[PDB]
Symmetry: D3
């Protein structure tokens, strides 16, 4: 096994539930954490329910962990205060906790929404300027900037994974480009943790899709090559869903419908 | 006069006190704001003392203003709690207040500290990835990202001015590169407000220094050309200050001594 | 199908005759057009005899069509008078007719000859400055520039396909790089018409050749990946043709022997 | 002098009338030509009435000339028929005539309208893809592409001068960026004819304006540096014209109001 | 067979002995050369034992050869005197001998050590500035620069192959990135000699490794696509060698342990 | 004064003679060295005559020096053995001597001839690939590569100055671009030695010429801005010298007539 104990935050969410199962082989003990109720710990599991904005709780959550896959916090556009707590204060707390406990390597769930306002016709490398499509996107930029600072100042290593659409299967036109299969995310995580040297790289979270918009070539040193391809689903999507309207944000902006979100108020 | 009423936040600080005088000609009324006490309003002035973290107060501060020079908030590395209030919550409040009040154009005091970990030998264009040198730098990145989102989503225009060292004169080796004269900041502000179309550009806040590190050429459309030059002060600095050690952050990193800051705690 | 009526111009030529057969499945009605006589319309076909220089005839040719594959005009280096009629006046007439009849999406047969003077050793992206190798190349540049203008001005969408060598199989050394199989051109056409949003992209018209010179990576959003490979024919070429002289334009310039053409006169 | 005989076409137009006077010192004999009547030849002058669409007349116009400043043809957006004659057929005739008479070096009046659809906020180098703003712009692209072909094929040298606004003085907000003074155009012409080697370079035709949009740095080898600056006129513009609306094409697109032109009809 | 006689220098070394066998099919006669003793010539072979520093001997070695695979000289970090003889003087002698004997095309064994000080995280294209990791690396830079000069001055063509680790299989973590299989080196050599036009290209000498650091895309015109992949060996390497320390040169610098070499003295 | 003792090699040559006088103010003692006879040491001078290929002599030459301006060796195209001794072996000896004596900062006289085969129309940044125009140019590349290796391996700092034409005044067409005034070289040297951090930068050795071919912008951190401008001499050059033939290497290649040099034999 890769390590003694691996922490997975956001473990009660759909993706966290997948990781709770798929990542078990990577560690002797998997510690699952979330604010929302977790299914009780089974064999080789520990479960912690805590508020990322509670610094003391996050310290205890991280203590004893050799790596972290951080999926926790707010995962969609919400009012500012929710995002502030889960994704901004929460991120500061996470990095301070790691700094106090041996700087376990972090896989950070960033998001395509950091660059949501780019047109879908534009191919992006990892250094493109952020164009976040809402407060959620801005908060993920915050996590990226904070992680980079901790890397430069303390040596803390983080993979900044800008997740596209990590779902079981592509099911709309945009997902033909953004789909990130479970298998490919799992292999990415394995490659991140196995690397002797990681740094603080931006990683585009997508499978090897023919219609992909993003260039991961500079990540070559990691030896991670995604194997799934959303294009296999194009025919299926055409046969089972209505054609998109060319005016829909779904087929105009990389962030899809998030660009149409207002600023939500509580 | 450029407008009826111009808001200057952070008006009680050193730079704010200068702008309170220098920007008077740009508007019929100058409204000054700060968390801390302000000298009483003279003719053609209004003064308000408020905390940027308080949304109602920020709404009142912005209402009726045709432009904003945003200098307020935390201006150096501090514990996260203080930065959160002044530069994160405070920024969200400022942008919401602007959105509710006619989207007055904003000059935002960002900072060189957003890129503080770059070596001094590296010349930077506006699109370089951020390398913030502490929590203060990360918080200015947050302001930039938030402003960009409000631009793409609502059309709010902001000049993101990455201020170097805006002081009366250069007084150390680093300032031969980073000096931003009062005159040149004033003329930049004039060029920002007069532009029919601004967008949300990154602006490097420095005078025309021979030893400058930053490239503003893509801002040509604004027609702003700084006129002062720190190089004139090299001899004086050499003959009146101790030669820097080559290992000193002051001559190694663009953020200077900020890279040496710890994470300060409350 | 993909549409009610598809127009294919230049349908009497070699490639047009291929497309008359291969594109039939894409529309309920295939309208074939050419300056030259066509084999009579079969079921599900309409045949039109049209001079592209005749604006009224062109208007009638386009009316009722939901899409256009524009192969017609002059296809090799010829005197200016002929190129003017078929590729310059003809293109203006085609774009005006489209503008008057619902702006049917256009696949434009541009040509490698727009960049014919580049050395074969240089890899080209879609934004390279044109280096046309004669009047024919210049006229294809005209088509591209005119199409771009109609896109920016009216939203007319066009795929600018810079065709390599679209033949049944590679038959000389240059085609190991330039070959564009029938199958791959057909799938490109299918991809162009299926896209919710196209724009006015330059597309390099070549199969997936090991020795290809051109980079279509920025077209990723379209989801088109050619499948054939000229490399499979390398041995066959060595066993059927004399070896190229290193001084031959055939192996020195991307436009091959077109660079050796003088200005032909009527 | 610089040569025995210099041809200036379009000599009846406003700019041509200026050049008739300003370029006299460059040649022993100045030959002036236009479709329209010219004021009679004075000493050291020859005057020619010539339709650029007439190949024989064009041949005679060019014969005996050691250099050409090509200002003639259609100078604004007009119907296709007129642009075809003056700027397409006319250009072919001009290049053929030069080819037959010693390849006299050519200064070609191209136009900013070849790139008219770019936003004014974007700084442009000479290699940017064309985005012409109407048929006039498209026709100037044709001139550039044709000139490049004659250069690669025959060695004919041409300066492709993308003229901004060549007027006595800036008179609106856009000209603070696009102004090209008479003096600076004259010195450019002098520099073009003096160069031992020219090639077929794109030259941005603007004075040294603080608010300029265009980058001529790669033309350094020519040793031409404009000296006038539209910025000197900013106050005068504010005191003689209404302030621009931010929605006006005049301040949104590099081609200004040309983007608002429809396709004009005869 | 590609040619009548192919010269392989450095034929007594490990790689040379492999090529002596693998390149036999490329020529009627294989001439093997080395400073050190060679197994006796078989049918279809010639053998010469000579010092590259001796011009007369190098002239005799080259005369009558249609191509050269230059593996000879010093192959690891050594004192300057040895490098000078084999890789500097020896290279000058080789190029002069070629120039005197019909300029037979050369495959030059350059080395990754020309760029050894780059971090393993940085992806390199062929044009990156050299960062040699010792005197051996500097000497291979000398070969590259000399070859380029002979190309520009005389038309001598050379493939500058920056060899990674050309061994039977990968056997440490670095070789997951640098491995260059025998098969892939052989096919590269085949592609180099068959090309009508080669020029003087930099070629990155590696198989198609998932963890590759180098970009050969601009070499597309040659039609060479490596087929082997070091990634297949990762598990074996992990389970049979000690995990690298993150501070080890082996996982920090592209040149691996060579960066740790001192300047060796005689 | 900048330092106790400054070494200037090549001190008997024309440029060294200028530096012997101009650099005196930079050090208490100037040590002059050359292979050729030096005018005897006057006050505050030491003179050493030695062979750069004699390692022991170079050690003694460098001992006790706090900085080196290295102009010595072969300065034009010569037979290989002369260049080998003065510029290759000589450079190794110089760097070993520096390494053994406190790594005094070095100003290295590299040359435009490292890039001599580039066309004069092409603008070059400091990272362009070398295109040396003879053995002399190759030897200067060797010095650059060796210096970079010593920088990376040992921290030795060197300014790699690619000298254009460092003469009293421009006197031909090429010098309008390549001229490097004495004043500007002297100020460059002062800036190099005063810098707390230098690194191993490529520096283009030319004054602020309107017709300059090279981009020094990335050197901004040094605070060196050349003040002279060869353009001031254009009129004078036109009036006092014959026009260049457009076919002359003097006006075609950046290396001028060096491209026409054969390989010289002793």
């Amino acid at each position: 096994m890769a390590m003694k104990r691996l922490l997975v935050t956001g473990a009660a969410g759909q993706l966290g539930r997948v990781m709770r199962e798929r990542l078990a082989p990577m560690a002797e003990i998997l510690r699952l954490a979330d604010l929302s109720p977790l299914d009780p710990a089974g064999p080789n599991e520990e479960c912690v329910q805590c508020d990322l904005a509670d610094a003391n709780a996050v310290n205890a959550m991280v203590a004893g962990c050799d790596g972290i896959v951080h999926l926790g916090g707010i995962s969609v556009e919400k009012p500012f205060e929710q995002i502030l707590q889960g994704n901004i204060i929460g991120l500061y707390n996470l990095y301070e906790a790691a700094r106090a406990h041996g700087q376990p390597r972090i896989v950070f769930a960033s998001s395509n929404h950091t660059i949501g306002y780019y047109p879908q016709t534009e191919r992006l490398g990892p250094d493109v300027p952020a164009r976040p499509d809402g407060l959620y996107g801005v908060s993920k930029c915050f996590g990226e900037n904070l992680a980079r600072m901790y890397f430069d100042k303390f040596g803390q290593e983080t993979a900044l994974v800008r997740i596209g659409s990590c779902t079981p299967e592509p099911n709309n036109y945009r997902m033909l480009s953004t789909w990130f299969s479970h298998d490919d995310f799992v292999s990415l995580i394995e490659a991140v943790f196995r690397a002797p040297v990681l740094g603080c790289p931006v990683v585009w979270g997508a499978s090897a899709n023919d219609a992909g918009w993003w260039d991961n070539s500079h990540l070559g040193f990691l030896g991670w090559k995604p194997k799934d391809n959303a294009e296999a689903f194009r025919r299926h999507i055409t046969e089972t869903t209505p054609p998109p309207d060319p005016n829909d944000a779904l087929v105009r902006f990389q962030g899809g419908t998030f660009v149409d979100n207002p600023i939500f108020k509580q």
